[PDB]
Write a protein that binds this ligand. Structure first.
Ligand SMILES: Oc1ccc2ccccc2c1
Length: 220
């Protein structure tokens, strides 16, 4: 299938990314507290439900939350400020809390079931979010005696996610803190704006995009 792209809500950021985040790819967004990475996740979970003309893929969402950062009220706000029905938008985000790193890996394995069910419907899964990719791994695998296993498990987890992305034409979006992934780094800019910097993309030039966080989620 042709690679599809989901608008981030920001024209500037979309331009940096070659049009939006890609299906058949993992986009990995880094940022310190308040960087905007979870706001970007929330915005994408709304945008993907729009038709292509409006920057979406007429899709459903699956969301794995490791640290209780998903806010349904924020989804409702972004949805309504963009013209969608807030209840319908929430209904099409399948939510799962991951309690630990093993559970997180199991959930990705389990997600395939729902992806298969929705695949040839009017709302196939088009976005799978893991927020955040590493919080449990960081918490559980302490020190050098644990590094080897941590990297192995994380590598397997990323491979599972890549497989879902490629096989089912899904954009995988994961957050992290400092290929395989398209890495974007968020930071505070001037006057409450945020800056995204794209780094080490094989076929997109590095660059920066400045964006805002509003009641619409993120936009220029
Ligand atoms: O109800 C469910 C079950 C499994 C899941 C796996 C990943 C994300 C959401 C999910 C929601």
């Amino acid at each position: 299938a042709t690679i599809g792209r989901i608008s981030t809500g920001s024209k500037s950021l979309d331009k940096l990314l070659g049009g939006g985040i890609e299906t058949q790819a993992i986009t990995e967004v880094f940022g310190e507290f308040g960087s905007g990475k979870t706001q970007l996740a929330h915005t994408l979970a709304v945008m993907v439900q729009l038709p292509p003309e409006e920057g979406g893929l007429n899709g459903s969402v699956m969301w794995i939350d490791t640290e209780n950062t998903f806010r349904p009220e924020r989804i409702r706000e972004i949805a309504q400020n963009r013209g969608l029905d807030p209840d319908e938008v929430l209904k099409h985000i399948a939510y799962a809390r991951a309690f630990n790193s093993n559970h997180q890996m199991l959930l990705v394995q389990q997600a395939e079931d729902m992806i298969k069910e929705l695949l040839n419907t009017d709302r196939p899964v088009k976005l799978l979010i893991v927020d955040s990719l590493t919080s449990h791994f960081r918490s559980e695998y302490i020190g050098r005696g644990a590094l080897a296993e941590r990297q192995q498990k994380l590598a397997k987890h990323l491979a599972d996610l890549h497989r879902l992305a490629n096989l089912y034409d899904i954009a995988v979006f994961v957050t992290n803190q400092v290929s395989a992934t398209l890495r974007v780094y968020l930071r505070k800019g001037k006057g409450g704006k945020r800056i995204a910097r794209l780094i080490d993309a094989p076929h997109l030039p590095e660059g920066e995009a400045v964006f805002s966080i509003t009641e619409k989620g993120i936009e220029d």
